[PDB]
Design a protein around this ligand. Sequence first.
Ligand SMILES: COc1ccc(S(=O)(=O)Nc2ccc(N(CC(=O)O)S(=O)(=O)c3ccc(OC)cc3)c3ccccc23)cc1
Ligand code: NA
Ligand code: NA
Ligand code: NA
Length: 285
Amino acid sequence: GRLIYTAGGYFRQSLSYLEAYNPSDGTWLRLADLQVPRSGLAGCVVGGLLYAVGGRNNSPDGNTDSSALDCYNPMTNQWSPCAPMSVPRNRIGVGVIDGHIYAVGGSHGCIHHNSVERYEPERDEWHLVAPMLTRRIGVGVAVLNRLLYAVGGFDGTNRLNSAECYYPERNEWRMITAMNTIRSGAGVCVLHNCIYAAGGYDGQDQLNSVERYDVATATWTFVAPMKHRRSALGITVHQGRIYVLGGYDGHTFLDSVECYDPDTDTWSEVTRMTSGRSGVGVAVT
Ligand SMILES: COc1ccc(S(=O)(=O)Nc2ccc(N(CC(=O)O)S(=O)(=O)c3ccc(OC)cc3)c3ccccc23)cc1
Ligand code: NA
Ligand code: NA
Ligand code: NA
């Protein structure tokens, strides 16, 4: 009975919503709002708790990048503040290794970060780790074999098809094979020993293409495309299928949730979000 949690996001302004989808019964729960609205954040789970990391509050009253880390306990339906990151990071990527949260890249105003930092929930402290080899905002992150992959993004000048791999024990990054497509604001996840990158923006158009990196072969291969082009989408994996949530298609904030079945190489529409939004954080617990 694990749920897909969606936190924050944007429609007209940054949002405070926390909602959870159950693929088993098709239900949505409306859970406790975030304390502060944010879009461009990332979600992750450590030890059955949901963490909302970074992002930005884009409001009619002003725009504020976030260094916040907040923790949601499903058992109490309550958000609790944690230690903030060293710097604000909007359009952040996040991955977890061995119970530690990595905050990768993102922007603070015009600064497009190459820096990376690591949170230890048991000490409630962040520290810097090695910087990525490239500045990346709108970067997607996934973890496989206790290595962390940072995929695509924007460096402040160029939208990127490159990607790189972090080695936590050695504390170093290495460039991996570049993707077939330039993608910022893609959904990036791990499924069956491959890193998937779904959708995003190539500098000109929102994308419906999906490609996956087979780590063993160092090769990116396209799979079936999504039905809807989308950037700033949420993504996650639940019971061996990919779910993509919302995003912007170039004209509309989407409420569409599509599900990828690797066995048949097919996408299908599985539910709608309660309202269209982009820039959400997503995780499963
Ligand atoms: C036209 O030029 C571009 C088009 C698309 C892109 S991208 O999708 O690749 N990168 C992203 C852009 C914006 C984000 N958000 C808000 C912000 O950072 O200011 S959002 O989801 O909150 C949002 C707000 C307003 C929007 O209007 C249409 C669209 C998205 C992003 C949030 C997370 C990840 C990437 C984001 C970049 C440039
Ligand atoms: Na610190
Ligand atoms: Na993720
Ligand atoms: Na609706």
